[PDB]
Amino acid sequence: MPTLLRVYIDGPHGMGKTTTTQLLVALGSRDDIVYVPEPMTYWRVLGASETIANIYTTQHRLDQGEISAGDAAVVMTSAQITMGMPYAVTDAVLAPHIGGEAHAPPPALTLIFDRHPIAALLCYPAARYLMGSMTPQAVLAFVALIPPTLPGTNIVLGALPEDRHIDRLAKRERLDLAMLAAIRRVYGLLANTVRYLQCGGSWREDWGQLSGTAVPQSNAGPRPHIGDTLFTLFRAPELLAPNGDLYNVFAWALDVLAKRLRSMHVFILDYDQSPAGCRDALLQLTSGMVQTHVTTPGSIPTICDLARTFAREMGE
Amino acid sequence: MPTLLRVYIDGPHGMGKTTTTQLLVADDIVYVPEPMTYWRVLGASETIANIYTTQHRLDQGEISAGDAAVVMTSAQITMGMPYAVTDAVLAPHIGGEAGPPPALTLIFDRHPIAALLCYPAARYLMGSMTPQAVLAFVALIPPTLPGTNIVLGALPEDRHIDRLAKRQRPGERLDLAMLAAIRRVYGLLANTVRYLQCGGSWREDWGQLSGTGPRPHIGDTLFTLFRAPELLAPNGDLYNVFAWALDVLAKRLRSMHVFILDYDQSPAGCRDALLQLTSGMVQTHVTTPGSIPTICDLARTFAREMGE
Ligand SMILES: Cc1cn([C@H]2C[C@H](O)[C@]3(CO)C[C@H]23)c(=O)[nH]c1=O
Ligand SMILES: Cc1cn([C@H]2C[C@H](O)[C@]3(CO)C[C@H]23)c(=O)[nH]c1=O
């Protein structure tokens, strides 16, 4: 009965996620830990041409009033599909190999992913909605498509003060502070949402506490108010019927959001430290993560093959 | 636990699927109708019209293939939302196969694969969707649960054109090139399920598409559409990311149970044939004691809100 440890490193761009993941992997034996990198080659060439350049280019032309919100939404929506494809297809092929949740002995294999499918199907789309370039209905359609949450889904989010974050970003994409704020807010909201659900929060019971505007710990702390969760973003006029509550189609999508996030294992990594400091901190966090059994005898080698294949073909 | 019979009425538009499903249920049989209100108002404004106008603009050379594909892509997300959200919430209620009449019969107007696979594939055949986008939607197809019975149609082309002309939805343009494409995709779909059920291995047969248990040839299945040059490396090999999506397609389609309804007849004749087809469909148990009444509620609420 070989066990597997899956860890998805996620959160806003520019905090040091990629470095620290590589550093952690460099500490292990090549055969017992494998890095699933960002699929940059899929994004710039294989799925479409220079998808990142197109997203940045679209938000800029919308911001400058050169294209309409509608024109922006179509490009952003199609672009996000391209951005999420390698994550969704990897999740789908991995799925059959994942058994139940297995502290416990060291895992036979550890897979560290640079992001989870919810980055492209939920977080970046929600931030683009805040930026005016995605409709809330399209964000909810993406949510309804998030794959069932496999057992042992450990997600590591990141903490980094805005000023240090902004500092790192003056490195070269395009320098969008509003987008940085939006993606930090969405990942904030996501950590609070997982805690709200894990504390027994029912969005349907608390929906009425939202009426207002905009004024995190994913696995500690008291229960957050629904106003500090992702459910706050969907009180948009577009989604409300003439009686005032959400149309049922959108309510069901929120039911799906709850189901998917409630069973996840979320951890917060302080990135306000040197690269080796982030590496250790993540390594200490990796000890409280949930492992799973695998379903077949050869699932370990198959999974390892999948991960190396992915890295070779799609990472730079 | 009580048993459930799920029946997805699908296939090319213009065949009379909605006419014949109306008649079928015209409290132990509930209909999840075509979510026309989502398409025209709730999800976006007149998405049908936007899809047919875009293809028309592309056919006339007013917009580029790239401009069309972005619109078709974004619009297929809108079209499929009602199906995807319905499947996501119904999923936890479906238990294993049960194999006497079911406690509930849920008849749907289409399955999620219409919007995540068949319409995208037809638009690729129409030059208005990239094959990479079709495989992105394929990777997102929900896992096939037990008892997924899908009814596809059979109808001669000329008769289908006649019926298509009467069944025009709001914003639709009569397009015989799209009719041919959607008829080709659904025919390929039926052959693909048979291919996979008789043990066909797309990876083993792939060379037959380029290097020259009775089952259809692979060139007569959906896999042939994915020999698209955009998905291949300079040496001709398919990129693994796309091969994986084809592995997902094989997994999702193989376990669906396909039934063919002859539409070349009257609405009562079509309705009657549909009912004859139900004896071979697979029923499942539900997972909770309360699964039945809540599924019924889902179905009525969907209908009331999104049905025309
Ligand atoms: C995952 C994801 C990323 N991105 C961009 C922002 C980020 O800085 C990046 C590297 O992660 C360049 C690519 C999106 O726009 N959408 C997405 O779904
Ligand atoms: C399911 C589906 C339908 N359609 C159109 C064709 C059809 O005739 C219709 C009603 O069934 C108008 C809507 C698409 O364009 N994409 C789709 O995924």
Three-state SS sequence of B183-201: HHHHHHHHHHHHHHHCCCC
- Residues found in chain A: 316
Partner-chain contact A249 B70, CB within 8 Å: no
The answer, yes or no, to whether any atom of ligand 2 lies below 6 A from the CB of B179, is no
Please report, to the nearest 10 degrees, the dihedral formed by the alpha carbons of residues A129, A231, A145, A194 taken in order: 120
Least Cα distance to A87 among A316, A306, A298, A254 occurs for A306
Rounded Cα–Cα distance for residues B188 and B211 (Å) = 21
Give the ligand whose atoms come closest to the C-alpha of residue A52. Answer: 1
Partner-chain contact A88 B139, CB within 8 Å: yes
The answer, yes or no, to whether any atom of ligand 1 lies below 6 A from the CB of A38, is yes
User: β-strand A98-101 against A292-294: which pairing, if any?
Assistant: antiparallel
Query: Residue B91: closest CA among chain A residues belongs to which residue?
Result: A148
Q: What does DSSP assign to residue A224?
A: P
Residue B73 structure tokens: 């892509």
State the method.
Answer: X-ray
Question: What Å resolution does this PDB entry report?
Answer: 1.7
Rounded Cα–Cα distance for residues A225 and A246 (Å) = 19
Give me the sign of the Cα torsion angle A233, A234, A237, A243. Answer: negative
Chain CA centroid to CA A154, Å: 11
Catalytic positions of B, written as ranges:
34
Partner-chain contact B136 A42, CB within 8 Å: no
Residue A23 structure tokens: 């550093």
List of E strands, chain A: 3-9, 33-36, 98-101, 109-114, 154-159, 265-270, 292-294
**Does any CB of chain B come closer than 8 Å to the CB of residue A310?**
yes
Regarding the domain with residue range A1-316, which homologous superfamily does it belong to in the CATH classification?
A: P-loop containing nucleotide triphosphate hydrolases (3.40.50.300)
Query: E strand or H helix at B16, and its extent?
Result: none
Chain CA centroid to CA B262, Å: 17
B9 pairs with which residues across the strands? B109, B151
In this structure, the number of other CB atoms found within 10 A of the CB of residue A265 comes to 22
SS3 B122: helix
Hunting for tokens 């309510």 — which residue is that? A251
Residues 6+ apart with CB under 8 A from B30: B104, B105, B106, B107, B295, B296, B299, B300
Domain boundaries, chain B: 1-308
Tell me which architecture the domain covering B1-308 has in CATH: 3-Layer(aba) Sandwich (3.40)
Mutation pick from B54, B134, B140, B247 vs chain A, by most beta carbons of A within 10 Å, is B140
SS3 A113: strand
**Does any CB of chain B come closer than 8 Å to the CB of residue A89?**
yes
List of E strands, chain B: 3-9, 29-32, 94-97, 104-109, 149-154, 257-262, 284-286
Q: Exposed, middle or buried: residue A316 (CB in 10 Å: 0-12, 13-18, 19+)? A: exposed
Nearest ligand 1 atom to alpha carbon A173:
12
In this structure, the number of other CB atoms found within 10 A of the CB of residue A96 comes to 15
Query: Which of A48, A89, A141 is the closest to B130 by Cβ?
Result: A48
Give the ligand whose atoms come closest to the C-alpha of residue B77. Answer: 2
